[PDB]
Amino acid sequence: GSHSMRYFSTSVSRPGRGEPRFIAVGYVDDTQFVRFDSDAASQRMEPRAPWIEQEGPEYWDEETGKVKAHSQTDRENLRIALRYYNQSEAGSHTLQMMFGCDVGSDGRFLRGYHQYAYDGKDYIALKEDLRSWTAADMAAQITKRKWEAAHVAEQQRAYLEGTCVDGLRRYLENGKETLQRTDPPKTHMTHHPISDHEATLRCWALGFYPAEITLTWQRDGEDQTQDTELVETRPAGDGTFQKWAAVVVPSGEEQRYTCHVQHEGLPKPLTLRW
């Protein structure tokens, strides 16, 4: 089906403790493939997936250059934002960036992204049309005007539709065994008494890939969203994911409940009963 490539960068200032730390990671779908850490000894973009190791010296040289350039730009951006907002140099601040592209099941460009957040809130983002910017506040409006003058939208659109898509397609082929796979969830149900009046029914999904999943409980076929404990989808550590959903069941009412599972690896949605 569809596929994505994303890079996520985080810059964190540390007043009185030297220059900001910069960390960037690259993903294809839910599989990480590269990292760069400004605090690390190598000072190189580093492999984080078996299928990226094939890439030659020119790749590592080029990618290292690009990510290092970004690290320096965001160091400057942190200083610029401090000035824009008149914030104290004593406080630590965070600048996050995400960029990348989606392709369809045929490998055609589908969507592109290029966006920043400052202290955990949206700062500026390239709109879906890849032609205009969304600016969160007056500070970001200054940045928007600069980027319009400099034609950043056109430059990034060219990357997103071109190199981004080409790279994603190449990785999808080289890592096809890992990337073009669906591991369906293995599902089951556990029962945990809490008192003689109540018990927990927990519905599990284990060993699934990609991470996207829907796990819900129904009572008499009715919505239970507000009465279900749903944990965040979590990595197993082996390239697969896990999740559970729980409801508190009154004694002897177990049979009124059904667990529902939707995943790309399941030809039909599952219905599970205790």
Binding site: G26, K66, V67, H70, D74, A139
Partner: peptide, 10 residues
Amino acid sequence: NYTPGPGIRF
């Protein structure tokens, strides 16, 4: 593949 430079600052 990472986005190319140069970054236009804020």
